[model samples]
Target: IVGGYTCGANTVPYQVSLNSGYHFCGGSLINSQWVVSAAHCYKSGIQVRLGEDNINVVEGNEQFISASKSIVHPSYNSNTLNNDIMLIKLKSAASLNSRVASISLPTSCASAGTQCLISGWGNTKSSGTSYPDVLKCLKAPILSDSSCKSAYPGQITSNMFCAGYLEGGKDSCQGDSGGPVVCSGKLQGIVSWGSGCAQKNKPGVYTKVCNYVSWIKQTIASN
Candidate 1:
């Protein structure tokens, strides 16, 4: 995370690492057995590590569980990066504790200017190798869809939204995709894409998670 601080070991309890062999993307634990992440992050041999704060350190609270199934949204468009959300069911349910738990799905959409948090172990700059060892989080405000449209012009869809300062200097970067953007204590967004790490008038774009709450619940129920 660019322009952020290391979070406490269990501060972001719903945070999870979507790993193959190493952390490739961040995810949010939505239930004991289901995780929400980005479809772009989907790959074979996915392992979900919950209760993790430090990627390089063997935190005892971590639960390294395998993905039994991964389902990307059927209408997901790779070209435009729309409907970028994905759901992964763990082979076994995560053992919930203080350091590992689920975050509530949003009951309503977050409006413009809602204070939210973006957390991950992603790169800290526009370029170079400066990924953090520990999870980092930055507080940002949700931008209106119109504002997002102005920023990216014709690129921002209803499925996407933007957050961060218009002047930039603080945003999500590489490896942070699928991470949570919590607003009012509910999951509101998922780190999806951006122009660069933190650039002027180019805030981080995210998947509007509230749009898929029904899909998420139905998929979980049927599966």
Candidate 2:
């Protein structure tokens, strides 16, 4: 919910929350049984809920499922958050409905300057001191690798890309990890890491999902 406004129920039905006793990260439903999330979001207390609007309250459409397995990219660099993506397999397939659906991955890498939408139950602040009651949505404009590198020198990687306002008004913050970044209604990236929430010039960094389409396709299939 960081740097954004509250979103209506089921607007982005593919969004999900990963938690143990509390909401720790966000994710997306790529299929009935597979979820795409940030590798850094991985935790021992791994459980997931789908079709959730208000995370604090259990709605009828909520589908609680245990994770059967968790797979972080072999090359994920925790220190730098490179390849910062992961896959979670549900113990059972989710029941598809208006409130629960999967999103489509992008056909190509997100173009520089592409505007996208992200949703999550993350904190409004980069400090991540608290979380929102309902899901929040924000608009982030993708920035070129050059612009991104200028903002965060020596940090930009090919597997990663930048998204946020240069002036710093809107962005995805902590607790928003693993959430979907949708451009043209297609999944382009996953909320990965960033310098801080909505900071000037320092746009949020994301896992360019399109860059790893082959890994995602193969991994989800085998796992």
Candidate 3:
């Protein structure tokens, strides 16, 4: 994340890295068998690494599991980036522990002023492959729907929300897509899209997680 610092070890237990050979995207472990991420990050032959602090180090707490299947939101639109949520079913259920566990989904929608934490291994720079070995995170307050709409004009949708500094600074960048935006210890948002990293008046936009809670649960129940 741009203008962010490294996260404390095990502080973000639910965070997982979507890796082929290296970290490509971020995701949150929602349950033993399901991980939620942005649909845009979807690809075959993905491996989910749980309890990862530093990607370059081999920590024993890490659990490497293959992705069994990925279910992208049926309404996801590549052009518009609407309904950009996706669920990855692990080949095997994760063994939960203090350093590897699931995070609760949002119970309610976050308000405009709610402060949230966005965590990932995305680029620290605006336009480079500055992916950090350690997880990075930043604090950003949710912007009002109207303000978010005004910033992106026709891009913002009801399923999306924006967070970060209006004057430019902190934001989720390139490699951070599908990561978690946590508020009150719950998964409130999913890193979806943004217009240039940390640009003035262009905050990082996220998928409103609360809106898809029912859909997530239903998908898990049947699949």
Candidate 4:
């Protein structure tokens, strides 16, 4: 949350709040009617804030949509962290405008080495709580498919993508799970896992958006 900035203007990003007044990073919008976020963000009483910069203020032409339902990937496994994706269906479709918008999902995500942006309100440094008020972002180049696969051996499956700084010290942390890893203005991945934030030889792993195209389409269609 420290190095990146909150999504501003026409984007629907999600924020998660805990009982102790702590908040975490989540995901972004895929359409005017639906938002794609992490399943873990659905803990009890967690609120999804759309189209706003300040989490505390929650003002200024922003839309606050209560989650009608949260659908986590059915096969999600915390142990392997597989299928670490979800959808936050709003009770109603958001009114699209300059201050509110939904991002497009990539039709062809097979292209490797694409540069993307990952933003959140997670810790700027590892092992820290959520940011006080602002959001943060970082630019990461998507690693080649083979490179990512080689890094984690069997763990990096076709359903996952990898990105982060090789130099370390900059990455998505605990609260960043379920956020967007956008490339070329299209969502390509979902923040899933990593050994740690910016750890050496361990880049951030994300749920491959391309692999879930049918699921996304069907999910939105069912709604």
Candidate 5:
């Protein structure tokens, strides 16, 4: 979103729409019965749609599943966006196929200089009238913690990281929270918070997924 371009379909089979009455945010189908998204997006009537390339219409292969439970991180800080990730369990498992499948969780986090992709249905520009009907993708580069801190000045925490362009023009904007940030085919980060869309030096911040792997696994295991 923000300064993103359409990434097309099939290339990102795990990408999904996290909807509450309507599609509000992007998510990833990490498992047949689980969707990984942003904690801040939790709302009543939330649901998940897999294998959807278009938001205006449903395809035959598209699978819509109702959310049975939504679990936010126990330590999630709303103001600062720390622990911004969450999981939504489906009432039934998804039927995987060529256009719908699950992606692998990251084994570790990526550091600065890493190039990654983030896709969403967020606004194309700041203060835009409407969100994109199709998924948009951006090649955002990860910034160093120090660099990110310099931009945010004590706002960036360990639980969160930064990804976007320094000169701007590419980032996840409004309506994009909870989207997947894939690096090397792994789920490395989750779109969390940031300043205005594509603003100079203000890279889009994200929840570092690797740090929460244990928590995610444990949460699902016990539930």
Candidate 6:
């Protein structure tokens, strides 16, 4: 089974995996037929798993799927991480079991101070390395627009949302990009970038999922 901690010492609620036995990152099943993740997770060929810990060993009840296509946000830029989101079209549909279920996206997500949860196999402590096995999760309160703007100076933009421990030393890190930052059981953002892995004043940044709702719908429709 998947297990881990969230920010502010809360427990993470979901499990996730990638095919290469790398660190666990956040992702959500948007529909029975598709999954949503960060664009950085899209390499030439990638595997995704749900409901299990060992990505390399699928002997248990865990389900595995090959992606037919990975659609990264058109405006994604690795240097700046703008539009750092993506969607995966599974070759087959997944069963709607409790351990494996789709997450909803918020219809109006711009409201400030929303609480969100981020999950991954990233470092438990800010400066540490990625987790060896199993997934981890953390909780973060969405920052107010003014707080976000001040936190990042001139970097904060309308396309991104801010989250992390205000006291710092806890956050999503390397190998954690493209994971989910869920709020109220709805997807509000995707882990994208930060000045550091939970520096005292540096909060984790994410792609605002709400800003691209129409784009996501259009892309999915065309595909």
In candidate 5, how many clashes are counted? 0
Clashing pairs in 6: 5-137, 6-137, 6-138, 7-138, 7-139, 26-179, 38-178
Answer with 2 or 6, whichever has the higher TM-score. 2
Worst ten in a row by lDDT for model 6: 1-10
Poorest stretch of ten by lDDT in candidate 5: 125-134
lDDT of candidate 6 over 20-107, digit per residue (tens): 5454455777887777788777776667676665434554657777778989888888767778888888788877675676777779
For model 5, name the residue pairs that clash.
Answer: none
**Model 1 poorest 10 in a row by lDDT:** 124-133
Q: Candidate 5, which segments miss by more than 4 Å at Cα?
A: none
Error of 6 at 197 (Å): 1.2
The number of the candidate with the highest lDDT is 3
- Global lDDT scores for all candidate models: 0.92, 0.87, 0.93, 0.70, 0.87, 0.71
Write down the TM-score of every candidate. 0.98, 0.96, 0.98, 0.86, 0.96, 0.87
Model 5, residue 128: C-alpha shift (Å): 3.5
Candidate 1, residue 121: how far the Cα is off, in Å: 0.5
lDDT of predicted model 4: 0.70
Clashes of each: 0, 1, 0, 5, 0, 7
Worst 10 residues of 4 by lDDT: 12-21
Clashes of 2: 1
Model 1: CA > 4 A from native: none
Please identify model 6 stretches exceeding 4 Å from their true place.
1-15, 21-25, 54-59, 130-132
Q: Candidate 4 vs. truth: CA RMSD?
A: 2.9
Please give, for residues 1-223, the per-residue lDDT of candidate 5 as tens digits. 8777787766789998987778888888888988899998888888788888888886566888899999999998888888898899999999989999898898888988899999988888865556778888898788899889999997988888898888887889887889999998889988888888888888899999999899988888887
Judged by TM-score, which candidate is best? 1
- How many residue pairs clash in model 6? 7
Better of 4 and 6 by lDDT: 6
**Candidate 2 accuracy as TM-score:** 0.96
